[PDB]
């Protein structure tokens, strides 16, 4: 029974990557959250990109953990990234592990010291997609059509 669920997806969720920069390639923003989205799908985790000038005077870690508890982080991660400064932070929520965390920080890092400032948030995601396995749940929806 591992297939997927047929119909019925989350209409929420607009956006998961979001830029103060304007230097961040359109098509490369869609490819970032397209990589979101299967974590969103396979393993209910949703990551938040934000693209920063600067962090002003609230530091990376404590920027993102202050978003994070405005959102209610249950499954959100906020990643906060100044390209400016070449400073960065990221934080997630009950559902995450400080080993997910940390592998993320890692992930975004590689790109980081590229500077290839959009890699680091789909890396992000990624590091978290590859655990998308086999792992169904019983589980199925159906809108059942009235009928007289």
Known sequence: TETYVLAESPEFYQDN???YTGQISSSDITNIQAAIDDVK????????VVFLSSFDGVDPETWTQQALQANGGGNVLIYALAPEERQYGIQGGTQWTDAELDAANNAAFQALSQEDWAGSALALAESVGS????SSGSSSLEHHHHHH
Do not use: N
Not at 41 to 48: G, L
Not at 131 to 134: A, C, T
């Open 131 to 134: 655990s998308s396995s086999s």
């Open 41 to 48: 799908a396979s393993e209910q985790k949703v990551i938040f």
């Open 17 to 19: 990557v979001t830029d």
